[PDB]
Design a protein around this ligand. Structure first.
Ligand SMILES: O=c1ccn([C@H]2C[C@H](O)[C@@H](COP(=O)(O)OP(=O)(O)O)O2)c(=O)[nH]1
Ligand SMILES: O=c1ccn([C@H]2C[C@H](O)[C@@H](COP(=O)(O)OP(=O)(O)O)O2)c(=O)[nH]1
Ligand SMILES: O=c1ccn([C@H]2C[C@H](O)[C@@H](COP(=O)(O)OP(=O)(O)O)O2)c(=O)[nH]1
Ligand SMILES: [Mn+2]
Ligand SMILES: [Mn+2]
Ligand SMILES: [Mn+2]
Lengths: 137, 137, 137
């Protein structure tokens, strides 16, 4: 299923030196996000750093949300994951997309400008309205 | 997309002193869950505690599930996340909704009664039936 | 919602000594995955190990993905979760399903052959096409 989503480029290297996120194959669930940094960031074991993407999206449709996830290789092999575990992006959010990068392992790790450091999926979401009851059926 | 979902209030402060979960905007993907506690809980670095919500839901439709996630600020800034990382809520689950709160950071943290300590999204889910094959197409 | 999904058995114990994953109830969101191991694996606090399932799936429909998650009991009570936090499975992936198991707690843990060590959900996904804009609406 396909959806056009408005994107605003906030840093002029995004789409040039730091490519825009894209899906590898027609069958990929997620796209890789890149670190928009001026210089490398050394991330010590146990530490968290906030990494900019240099872009904003506007999903706009309240039936859709995005979820940011670690990359599998980085998480398994290097312990490079997300400080909020999963990043939930609201349909009405229009600020810069930010990545909370957390080193959950035992070795220091260099976050390089342009590196594919996390990934993101778009999933349908349902807004609940609670119906108070005394007992369930 | 909208869905009415049956809720049973298990603690009489829920909906009064401890407001029921609600979506901030029409475009919010998730709603914030509150700690239903008699007194604050001090959570040391590395530790896990089980936090009640004082409510039960019954999703009932097997095409829907909920996922509990950390809040982004708490996770990034304070290392306050979930001990099971993501909490998966089945459509036929009718028990109290519980939150496994884990301090993944280096500073002790006070969990206060009524605090918005996690969030929850409802997503469509598909039940797979496995079809055994010798080779894929 | 239901979907037949092609599965290839890679280890002849899968479907015999190590049962194939199944949903507990008609209302379960996820199914439990089992460790396909010759012998137990002792996993020390802080450590990560790669656990085979002995099977491959081919989702095939680009409108669907799977997400691997910790089990709630294992994560909350034992600190046995996933090294990549959430495992994202692409529709065009045809390799062995692997589980990155991470001990985030303080006690060593024995991973036994056949144990239900994680769970997996199938969710619809949307592929985004970015539409560059100067300003949002
Ligand atoms: O827990 C996991 C996560 C992923 N995979 C497989 C399926 C997926 O399609 C592929 C690639 O995953 P990724 O998140 O794109 O990882 P990366 O880009 O590091 O290779 O690895 C697994 O077997 N288990
Ligand atoms: O990894 C993340 C998570 C969130 N956000 C943005 C989008 C989201 O709509 C907003 C708020 O997220 P939240 O989970 O509601 O956080 P909290 O209530 O702490 O502000 O922050 C990001 O840029 N990156
Ligand atoms: O954060 C969570 C996760 C789960 N549950 C409830 C709802 C779910 O339907 C049930 C079982 O969850 P599970 O992941 O299947 O756990 P396990 O097999 O260890 O019991 O526990 C919660 O209240 N909170
Ligand atoms: Mn990848
Ligand atoms: Mn919020
Ligand atoms: Mn279970």
């Amino acid at each position: 299923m396909m959806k056009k989503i408005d994107v605003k480029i906030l840093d002029p290297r995004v789409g040039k030196e730091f490519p825009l996120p894209t899906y590898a194959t027609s069958g990929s669930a997620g796209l890789d996000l890149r670190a928009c940094l001026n210089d490398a960031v050394e991330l010590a074991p146990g530490d968290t750093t906030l990494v900019p993407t240099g872009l904003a999206i506007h999903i706009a449709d309240p039936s859709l949300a995005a979820m940011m996830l670690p990359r599998s290789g980085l998480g398994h092999k290097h312990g490079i994951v997300l400080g909020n575990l999963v990043g939930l992006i609201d349909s009405d959010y229009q600020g810069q997309l930010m990545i909370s990068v957390w080193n959950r392992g035992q070795d220091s790790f260099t976050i390089q400008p342009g590196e594919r450091i996390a990934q993101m999926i778009f999933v349908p979401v349902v807004q609940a309205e609670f119906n108070l009851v005394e007992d369930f059926d």
